[PDB]
Structure formats: C-alpha cells, structure tokens
Amino acid sequence: HSKGLQILGRTLKASMRELG
Known part of the structure; x- marks a missing residue:
C-alpha cells in the first residue's frame, strides 16, 4: 500500500x- 506514495x-x- 501507501509506502509507494509516501517514500516517493x-x-x-x-x-x-x-x-x-
């Protein structure tokens, strides 16, 4: 999930x- 908008x-x- 949102690790892929968080870290970017x-x-x-x-x-x-x-x-x-």
Whole structure:
C-alpha cells in the first residue's frame, strides 16, 4: 500500500528543499 506514495513524495519533497 501507501509506502509507494509516501517514500516517493518524501524523497521528491526532500529533493526539492535539499535542492538549494
């Protein structure tokens, strides 16, 4: 179940606030 939206959203969001 939602591990497959959790970790992607979390990773994507991290990826966009750890960007610069």
